[model samples]
Target: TCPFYKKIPGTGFTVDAFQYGVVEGCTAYFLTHFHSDHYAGLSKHFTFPVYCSEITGNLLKNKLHVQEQYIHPLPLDTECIVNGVKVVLLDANHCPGAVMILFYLPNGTVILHTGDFRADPSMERSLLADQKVHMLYLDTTYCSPEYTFPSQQEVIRFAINTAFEAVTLNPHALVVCGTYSIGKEKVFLAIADVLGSKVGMSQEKYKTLQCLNIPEINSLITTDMCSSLVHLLPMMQINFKGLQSHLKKCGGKYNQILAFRPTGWTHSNKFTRIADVIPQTKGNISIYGIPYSEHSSYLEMKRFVQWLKPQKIIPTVNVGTWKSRSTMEKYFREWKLEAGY
Candidate 1:
């Protein structure tokens, strides 16, 4: 086990252990993405070298006020020897600039650190597909059997279709989508693109989106309010009263509102489909908590561990609580047993 202290077992490189404030044996630092949770404890200054994806490096420098001296950009799908250990960065498919790190130690052992990922099937053909990882440091955000909701493709498709139909049903209705700092962007962009409409957002959100390097998003978002019926806001703003007042603030021109809030907690299941997730609607507002999770579900994580058949598994999240932590370890034990003799 890698343990809960954020230290990688063998190597001198620590992954997402910035909070430790200069780990004793750490020769360098590997950051998986631009998210705050992973980058916790990192400030505008650093005492060690930080390695991450190019996009993530840009975000750290521009958004987080990190200087260029401490940030190192690594290209995806490429291997490089960093101070004797071979390292590779692979897309996590969880969020923009997120990555799964592969470390080949000088001792001939291999380590895979999945920062936060959805474990998409496309990963099957990548470099780490069938590689026998000696230690698999996993993101166990949804490790239990109750978190499987639906596939990302189907959820995105259903979301776009719902937006298409919702807009067609009422052209005068203002559509709102709940999103995070950097995740769930595809949901809103797809909705806006499918509706052939524009999205309204605050400059703060717009600046974050610009850091993503997504080209088409510039054309789809507008800074001016009421210019677009479809608007994007923080997840909590999709609430009933939030929508009502937001509409009232805008004007009576678009009285009704349609909101699509993406999340995984709406339904706790092992294999719930999109058809089963019914919408929540009121007098003039329709809200859909689309199960568009950025983290891998239990089923996806199971498949990944099964596919890789790693020699050992180490969970990186949900290890704080006794009940949740033990339950996750049980799943890990059962999955390894199921994978091999």
Candidate 2:
């Protein structure tokens, strides 16, 4: 049985095919990544057979610790038959477990769905190998002409530099950087490579490293590990009373707290609370707005559209309901297409 009920053409039984059914009366679903937006919605409600890459499956199971009967784990580039539909998973370089999906219909129509993807050479090369693409549904998060984003290496450098500044300013203090459990591993790695022995980490982050089988990092104690390096922690645990006590135990003359803007936090200025918890005497609280986003830049999106040269491109991930719809309409006009959907 399908999860969400939709109208069954000419039948009284409610079918679950969305507005546009991939088939006349069949249910279909495909997962592109482990990002909260992609998986969270389907994790609870969409109970149809979902297809994804092997790594994405492991992340969902190991990281989120999710367990479900309907998830079908497929290896990268493997063509699999699901609910009478053919689908292939291609590498999406946005994150470790990210993938772009290609759906092939029985009538010879092919659709390429680019999930929060980047224009890295590896991903580009893999996609270009496929000479045939009929319709492309692209990621248009930063599709506006004025939007710009910092490169991955640049963001890594900024993280390292910020950590170094914190260390130099507070030699007798402990530095705490807030990031997601699995997502911010690279920031800590950059800190370690730059400052080495000075960084410190909370028990939660240490556990994450251990679960990832990173023994070299796991062996080091929190303080000694992040002493010279940048210490990393999650913000949610930072507010807990028990975690505060632990921070006090590790506190020193140069105690510093650093937090990055999680997705929607920036638009609403939610990080103001950090100033309340950290005492004024220990050191100043520094929150950096370094552009470390994984989404494609506006220029990158334009370049991607040019390269793909698809018959039509549909954009998603815009700002608001009315604004996004209007923007999509404008884009359709420029591309000379009827509609994105």
Candidate 3:
């Protein structure tokens, strides 16, 4: 029942219902974020009231066409009571409007659902002060020790510096930064500010960012690709064919194309930490993968668990699958042993 949607005992609410389909007895639904994996099976036709951050609610209305009345926006860091349960929403630090939910049950037990977040010291301090966590639904995306990478801030700085260096070395080149449609806005914003140029993205991405109403980003987004020397493209659209077409359009105006991809997979090694900057070059096209991720690394997850020290830890993944379940069990055992529990 870790990954599957379940009714909160003593409460009339359901959390993250997708694979299990809609529950007949549940009165309300809670959404952690807008990631496809978390937002699956949700549609505009649904009737129940869904609670999420203001940004997510806007996406539901504009992107998915969900009715305004069905979308309930929960402000971050504020406590509210719903269906006789006291709930507090905290910033998950994963994406814009991403949040972690804390439920204070009637039985005096506290349950925490960490939607998906990279561990942060200040956030940890805030949660640790209210120490009675009975159950923790953890984000075990990179639960194994092989996932060791630098902090997000460090990697973002490295990416900015690398892009600047590449541009300085090749003034006639175009700098392309790959990012998710919703996440990794910070990197692109920083690059835009440093280069004193607007960041170009797809119309769809621009609309999504526009809903956030962020002044820094709103003024920096442009649908015209040729409007800026530095373009922000989706990660999935950074392949050979994709870059080739853009390169072809530039003709002889741009001498080279330097692409930067900041992700967690770049530095996943069993026994060693990969270099901060991993570069690959092909002709006039250069691609660099920086280890900047939103998910918690293995060590970060361990420290988070030690701090919370929940009575039970349930992974928010598909545990019904044989391979996934086995892997989670191994990691859970290792985590418990390391924590001396």
Candidate 4:
């Protein structure tokens, strides 16, 4: 139910509205990341000019086949004039190349669009001294009190340690980790560095990682299954049937498979404030869901809003449904009331 595009009041600027095919007349098109949901309607034949980070621009050209002429790469933290507005990109910490755009309007209004991002100490410090923000386009994916997860770094450490323990218990087990195409590269890199072995990845993932131009990740990536004991698989192929098919191709070389799904939903219940590891075993495969997420939790969201103190808050997702809107409004009121604002 997210809006197709949010128009800047009294201006011709628009943000992240490619999904609705409305970029034809906008002054410029800005992309936060290359996630399918964020870049839904973009295609190979797209003719309109687009602006994003260099990594995202590469992804658009290679993965989505977006034309090179229409892609504009913006460096992080550097302010540039687009049309009549001053714009800067900040690290989102959600995925590689994900950015939160800050727009300085002609009338001294500052608008911030926090495309999927987590609460990082450095980010908070950077914005603490800024002038008042007029409007905030927030990533409200987990805006309910039930979502109170740990930071990404903490969860990554837990996941890596848990992976080591699981492999130690079953020497012949093939450790499989689930992740999106662009995000969660750090998890696999950490596992590979700790185990001192090259990590196996599908061709698609290898290509994407190759384009990232990182020495540490490039050296540890492998396509051969036998090249390493740990394999990084896409999140979509983490099911029982997928594991069975994968095992069948291995010719019984490994006795077992242990999978890990590092996500925030592990601590979805209200009682769990900190991070915890939850394990599930089905036959020979053991799956673990770790509390690792890239988005801000409900508590973090409240903290972010309190710090920014924007005059208005806009929910990036779930804007079209009445139930979703009502629930979000209630949460906003509760947050403001508790903060004595």
- Per-model TM-score, in order, reads 0.92, 0.70, 0.91, 0.91
- Top candidate by lDDT: 1
Report the lDDT tens digits of candidate 4 across residue range 53-146: 9989989988888999999999888888887778889989888889998888888888888888886657766743567788888898887777
Once fitted onto the true fold, the runs of candidate 3 whose alpha carbons sit more than 4 angstroms away are 1-6, 19-21, 267-276, 318-327, 330-341
**lDDT values, one for every candidate:** 0.81, 0.56, 0.78, 0.78
Task: Choose 2 or 4, whichever is better by lDDT.
Answer: 4
Between candidates 1 and 4, name the one with more favorable lDDT. 1
Model 1, poorest ten-residue lDDT window?
1-10
lDDT value, residue 77 of candidate 1: 94
Please write out the lDDT profile of model 2 over residues 255-320, one tens digit for every residue.
Answer: 555444323113322343322222222234545544556777666766666566677665546635
Clash pairs for candidate 3: none
Candidate 1 lands at a TM-score of 0.92
What would the per-residue lDDT of candidate 1 be over residues 143-257, giving only the tens digit for each residue? 8876767677888888888778877888787889887768778888888888877888998887888788788767888888667877988888888888887888886778688
